[PDB]
Symmetry: D2
Subunit: 424 residues, 4 copies
């Protein structure tokens, strides 16, 4: 229906023999002194080396990485490169080059400041991007934001290649080339959504998350996680926890065990902003995917309140919603306590899965609007979480049909540790 055609300008192939394409970066360590650099070469393996240097020092260094390939049904990937640059200086612009053997391409990024209590930083929020014309408009709006996002928190559902026949993994390549104009210059922090599962036993593809996991690496060992699908990083004044809605989280499982330990490592005097990313929302008053989040909610919601998470970001529902600060953790089967109540130790739950997908919005809502829902609207767009300091962060939502500087919704987050005031 509305997916951009293969010959669209956003899908053009970087010219020259074996030119790197689908270039993308993300944070490569726990505190921001490292960057994972990733790209694909189509004509031959090529080299996995990255040349990099700061604008100031100017001393050029080489980092070595690794190449991998995969198959999916009758698809054969090109040559995938992942290379980690390490021991970078904080708050510094670096250039990097890939394709060192045949066609070199140059890019740049800016390391975050060192982690600290009072360190401003602006996060973009994008979920369920896809590669429709709507997707392209959302990305344009983010790039043109006057607030200037410095990192994208991506709440999952990347390419939607699995909607195509045999999950036509070409649509992973096109999505890589489409997003390069943003993610080659600033990290995107990856969350796994249901369109990344790609469980297709009918064509003998039964390894969950396979194409996504080959194409997008994350620094999961840096937080002592055993799986790429849940992990944490710190960046500026934020501690960001990424969870996997489609992995196990029963008591005693790896993800549950890891998250319980991870929450104990949080130090709000170093990173006052505690942020959780997951694909499927625990609070959601849209009909589509209603109550799908209940299972994870039974395991994790009380932990979020106990540790005073500031905000939880999710996607999956193709629309926008912002909850009140509520909790629904008092239920004991026979005591009848199953209704959410205002709770100032609880996070705000934000659904931001509306960046475009394959061109369809979720407009059917549960009626009436429940007390726990502060704002909801079925429009395309993206968010910005703008940390001013340890007490204040400004969240805004920009609609695709508005000007790039118009915020149809916006709210001040008051920090749950340093300033726990009603921000209704």
């Amino acid at each position: 229906n509305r997916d951009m055609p293969l010959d669209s300008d956003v899908f053009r192939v970087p010219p020259g023999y074996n030119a790197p394409q689908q270039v993308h970066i993300t944070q490569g360590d726990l505190v921001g002194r490292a960057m994972i650099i990733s790209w694909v070469t189509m004509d031959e393996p090529g080299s996995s080396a990255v040349r990099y240097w700061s604008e100031k020092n100017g001393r050029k260094r080489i980092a070595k990485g690794k190449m991998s390939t995969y198959r999916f049904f009758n698809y054969s990937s090109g040559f995938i490169h992942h290379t980690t640059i390490r021991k970078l200086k904080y708050n510094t612009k670096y250039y990097y080059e890939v394709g060192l053997r045949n066609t070199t391409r140059r890019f740049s990024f800016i390391t975050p400041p060192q982690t600290g209590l009072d360190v401003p930083y602006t996060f973009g929020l994008i979920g369920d991007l896809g590669q429709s014309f709507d997707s392209n408009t959302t990305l344009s709006h983010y790039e043109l934001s006057p607030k200037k996002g410095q990192t994208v928190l991506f709440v999952g559902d990347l390419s939607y290649a699995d909607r195509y026949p045999n999950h036509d993994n070409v649509r992973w390549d096109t999505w890589g080339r489409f997003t390069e104009r943003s993610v080659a210059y600033q990290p995107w922090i990856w969350t796994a959504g249901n369109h990344e599962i790609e469980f297709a036993p009918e064509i003998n593809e039964t390894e969950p998350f396979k194409p996504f996991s080959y194409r997008y690496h994350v620094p999961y060992e840096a937080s002592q996680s055993t799986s790429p699908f849940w992990y944490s990083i710190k960046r500026a004044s934020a501690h960001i926890i990424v969870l996997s809605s489609y992995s196990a989280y029963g008591r005693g499982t790896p993800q549950y065990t890891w998250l319980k330990k991870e929450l104990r490592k949080v130090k709000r005097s170093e990173t006052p902003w505690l942020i959780v990313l997951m694909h499927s929302p625990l609070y959601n008053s849209y009909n589509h995917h209603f109550m799908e989040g209940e299972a994870m909610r039974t395991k994790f919601e009380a932990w979020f309140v106990k540790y005073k998470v500031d905000v939880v970001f999710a996607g999956h529902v193709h629309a926008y919603e912002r909850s009140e600060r509520v909790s629904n953790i008092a239920y004991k089967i026979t005591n009848g306590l199953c209704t959410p109540v205002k709770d100032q130790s609880a996070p705000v739950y934000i659904t931001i899965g509306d960046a475009g997908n394959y061109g369809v919005i979720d407009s059917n809502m549960i009626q009436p609007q429940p007390e726990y829902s502060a704002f909801r609207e079925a429009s395309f767009g993206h968010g910005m979480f703008d940390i001013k300091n340890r007490t204040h962060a400004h969240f805004s939502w920009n609609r695709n049909q508005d000007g790039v500087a118009v915020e149809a919704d916006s709210v001040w987050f008051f920090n749950r540790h340093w300033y726990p005031v009603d921000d209704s």
Copy 2:
């Protein structure tokens, strides 16, 4: 005192004599309908042969099936040589002998294949959970094997050896458990469910593959029901369709297990197997203090499916005690409508917790008071269950306590089939 595990020199742990004698012999159903058997054993002195020699009493024709040997390491433990061999194309309702260790020390055993699946085929299933290797465990197993109801197959709802309570999960305690349970499971299949003591996720000793020792030692015929994982699968046996679930695997919407179960419930034909039985480790209904509400997560996913498909019974363990629910459901909840109380629902399964076979000697006696309406009967005693199918409409469940005689049932109830005879059996 504090430790009730049986000592390493106990008679139940003795090593069968002879060079490279097979030990830890165990069998389970090896296909979808009962014409195959997975034969498993360990040799300790050298790899040995994975051949099984076998013959029916009725035809006396000796045959050879070939299998595979495997090994694993766990921290500083190195396993012996694990053999799994599937015997196929067995005749129904037929007694077979089989032999393992064909190269050096041969040992002979026997089993009886079930009748062909069918509407009115009687069959008696044992129910054992959280068995362990304490003296209480030995007593439960004795009561099972001395039962005049005579179980023909054990439905085992998880937590096997409890080896993971030992330092570095001392996998020697898996070997002892295998030698101990052999006197039953070498002669009749046990249907394996994975419990939380099978997870053995221990990153501090760089052992991060969930279920590894369990999965090397206990194979299941999971491909036969088009499952992609040993931890959830289905078998049919006599008049029963048995669905085994994994509490400690993913079951979110779109995951392999969730996808497999949705499809498997639509393949169920109650005109062929009228008794629909679900095994899982962690109970969805549980009024004991220990592990209270741990099953809530899977309940939000699957309970409505069990009601829609009129599951007859759900068996679970994990709680070290016995409980039998009423037929109830709690599937009307919509966040803001306040409908969170379980109600009687004749379309729902009975939920039975039967994790009381012994573990490491500890019973769970703290119950939430008063007994809730959804709970029909509960008791903190060691024992085992029996699910005795008479025909498409009637099955008789009974619970036997270790402190009673082997022929005494302390709880019992008639199941009226939800598909063929849905009359009120409360």
Copy 3:
């Protein structure tokens, strides 16, 4: 450059979605009751199932096999299928079909007679085939031969894909489509030559024989070999031993150990004809590859004499040569005994690497023709080893430039065990 271009008729793709191509069969067991069926599908994995039935009876059965794929530099193969049909009846025509899920293709083969002393059987001899116009002519001559070859003994150097840039493995696919018109209907017995090594560290391909070994499977475990590159089969009245010139054969290595035990298992009272295949010739009087066979000769020649091997076939030299029965096994470094002498207990050594390759013949011969060389000529062509009974086999060599019925060289073999009499020309 005389390689046939890609649009040649011999390289055409079988029509229909995911149609099997590059179909080829070989013996699948030790004695001839089994057949390995191999093929590639290009559009998607497909089924590895093979449907088969005998022409007279007709009970259609299914055999299940395996699919594999590989990469070589920036090449990605299609989906390779290998499936063994077992427990066939001897001397029986069978139909078989592949591509069961989408586009089915049907072929046939005739199982050999049960092994016996006097069982006639006609073996083709083809080496260093390649895909030039000369290659196509040789294959044409073989398939039109009035002698009617029933199984090809192939002494190595298949596709010559490794002469292309990055070994362009597309030229393995084309060769499979070209050869199918013969090897889909009768087994070819595969020997690994030096163009199969494909050792290319400069493009990080360091696994020897990788493309060859993915595409061409052999029944090596049936003779207790641990490697596909050396193995043994029996067919009709012949015991055939296949060796790897480019694998280790020092004392104590797998191949040396295996050959030693295998020769002990030979029973000439059951299979009278003992035949060795290897790529590199032990006896070779051409300048090209002169004396490359010496290393293996020092290890195995004395064994071939001890066990009275009837014939040894090799390729590698792009020409034809037939030796006298000779041996060179008395050398002791300082005793001066280094000349081949006549030896009635030795095999005849035949170089038959002249099926066409990429169109070049090896014409530089060392002069004069040495006493050990009975006949040699630098012409393209192929051979036929035509077994008549336990005492007599007729060998003939047919040149591409002659008519298909013209034997330019021809000799009767007297079996070294059952008719140990001088058969020299």
Copy 4:
């Protein structure tokens, strides 16, 4: 049976919980600035970290390595560690420590001087060592040599564990503990002999060299080899080429292809001494294994003459032999040129497989002694290749029945590139 029993003092287990045992080192790079550190822990995996520092400066650094395990029939190995220390300073004594988590053990080595034309260096030659009482004597004689060996060139046949029932791989562990008293302190340069093949299809062990290759790593990638069984290193003024008698070496095979290119890289103005190690001798006048080396000789002898190899060392024959400088490379099947002739561009071929094995010597010799044989004797012992400078190196053979300072055979090597005097 003359193998030392399991309770011999040489086989004592280092005490302490999870104490490293079987510690051994070898050169870790092409030119000598790196060291592969190897050891086994038996009680649990432990850490693969190596702590090391130079004795003068003293800055303590950590290198991270890798742990591996293997099975052979019914044997399960301990936890094998391999860790490369890199970027070391030349001609410098270093301390290193293994077993950093529970029981630490400390050793030392001395890096060689930087490669160069006139750098002196003393190499021990040991072959077919084994773990018999003769083996212990040879190793004692080597340790006590007044010439002071600084690196051992080991021409193969290590533990002889494969003579035991099911190749009882415990006899690899005992050999590792026995040789530690030398190889933990100076590199041994490993060659693979026939007792390392361990190809045993009758007990379903069909991977050649499996136990050896898990236990003893070599820096084969540093010379662009694709296999651990052939490689080259440079140390001081020597270029050392290690070949594999029981791998493939036909034309076009990886080993053949590698050797041809490696010989092209030798620069005799940087390393004047060109040394080849292989297990099976190309020249051998003993009855045992006579002419087993002919196959490799047909492929590589002409290359050795063409590139003027100084010396070729081999083992396999359980005895000592030293050849004249000869070549036998003119044979063309019919031309009758099959007798070795004096050739001053050819190497000397030395058989030194007499360090003890399991207690048997090879005494039956071809009679009369052929002209290509300069000296031969069936006694246990070891050799020393003592490089003085670019022109002169002194080779000596010490018998176990003699005093540790007595040379029963002794010859000057005159360098084939800088001083090709008739020797």
